[PDB]
Amino acid sequence: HWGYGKHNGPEHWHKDFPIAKGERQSPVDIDTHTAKYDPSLKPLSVSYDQATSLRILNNGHAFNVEFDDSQDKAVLKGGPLDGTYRLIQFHFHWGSLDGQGSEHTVDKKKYAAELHLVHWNTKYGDFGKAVQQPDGLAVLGIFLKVGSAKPGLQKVVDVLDSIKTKGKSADFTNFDPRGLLPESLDYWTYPGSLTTPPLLECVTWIVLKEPISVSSEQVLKFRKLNFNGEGEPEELMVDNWRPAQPLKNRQIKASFK
Numbered sequence: 539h540w541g542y543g544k545h546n547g548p549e550h551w552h553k554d555f556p557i558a559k560g561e562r563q564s565p566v567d568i569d570t571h572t573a574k575y576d577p578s579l580k581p582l583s584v585s586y587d588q589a590t591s592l593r594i595l596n597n598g599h600a601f602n603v604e605f606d607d608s609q610d611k612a613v614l615k616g617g618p619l620d621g622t623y624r625l626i627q628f629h630f631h632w633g634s635l636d637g638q639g640s641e642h643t644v645d646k647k648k649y650a651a652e653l654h655l656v657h658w659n660t661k662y663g664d665f666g667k668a669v670q671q672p673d674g675l676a677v678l679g680i681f682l683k684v685g686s687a688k689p690g691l692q693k694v695v696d697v698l699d700s701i702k703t704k705g706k707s708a709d710f711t712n713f714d715p716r717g718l719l720p721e722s723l724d725y726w727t728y729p730g731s732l733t734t735p736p737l738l739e740c741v742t743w744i745v746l747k748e749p750i751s752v753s754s755e756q757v758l759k760f761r762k763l764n765f766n767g768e769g770e771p772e773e774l775m776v777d778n779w780r781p782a783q784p785l786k787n788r789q790i791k792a793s794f795k
């Protein structure tokens with residue numbers, strides 16, 4: 539029954555998921571002055587040319603655009619990663635206002651939203667097994683700021699009306715996730731966790747330095763989605779982000795400078 543409301547939000551999650559107060563929780567604040575350039579980091583490899591999107595789903599806490607991951611098509615490798623990670627889905631976290639919405643922060647700055655492209659390590663066979671491993675997932679995070687529209691995001695924005703409430707899904711084939719990437723692949727990386735329950739500590743986070751720009755109309759449409767299901771009191775899907783967690787015994791490494 540976890541959610542983002544006053545009575546079931548992030549501050550309550552620890553009661554059902556004690557790992558919420560663990561040693562490598564996400565998101566975190568990225569202190570750009572403390573992050574250290576790591577020359578041993580190999581270049582990041584995002585191969586989405588053969589990506590196969592299938593459906594978009596409103597699951598009550600965000601909307602996921604799901605991909606066919608039964609074959610090695612859209613994969614992430616290189617950077618801090620050893621092995622190949624297959625793209626399974628992407629979703630966003632956003633706010634009720636342009637001044638908040640991202641999960642990670644940069645020098646405490648909050649962006650209007652944050653895109654997460656979730657990938658699982660093929661050496662574990664499937665996603666369910668991968669989430670039980672410390673290096674099971676790789677999530678590529680991309681910040682969104684409000685300004686000019688993102689052409690590549692419009693197809694997602696226009697299908698949202700068809701999945702307004704929890705449990706609704708719609709066919710979403712042939713969507714190219716390459717259209718959601720910034721120009722530069724410079725990034726920060728650190729070991730962490732899923733940012734939603736079960737908050738498993740199975741993620742290598744790779745967060746891009748360069749935000750993409752989306753228009754006020756694009757994010758405005760995100761804020762029209764609902765957390766509730768059809769026929770229930772309307773709860774707008776906004777502020778579905780978890781705040782920054784203690785960094786603890788971790789170092790954030792930079793791929794640049």
Ligand SMILES: NS(=O)(=O)c1ccc(C(=O)N2CCc3cc(O)c(O)cc3[C@@H]2c2ccccc2)cc1
Binds near residue numbers: 656669733734736
């Ligand atoms: N924000 S994030 O760290 O990038 C992230 C990653 C994966 C997942 C995910 O795949 N989850 C967690 C939430 C969730 C909620 C459901 O209703 C559900 O049907 C599945 C999930 C999955 C999940 C569930 C159990 C164990 C691991 C993942 C969600 C968010």
Ligand SMILES: [Zn+2]
Binds near residue numbers: 629630631654733
């Ligand atoms: Zn996420």
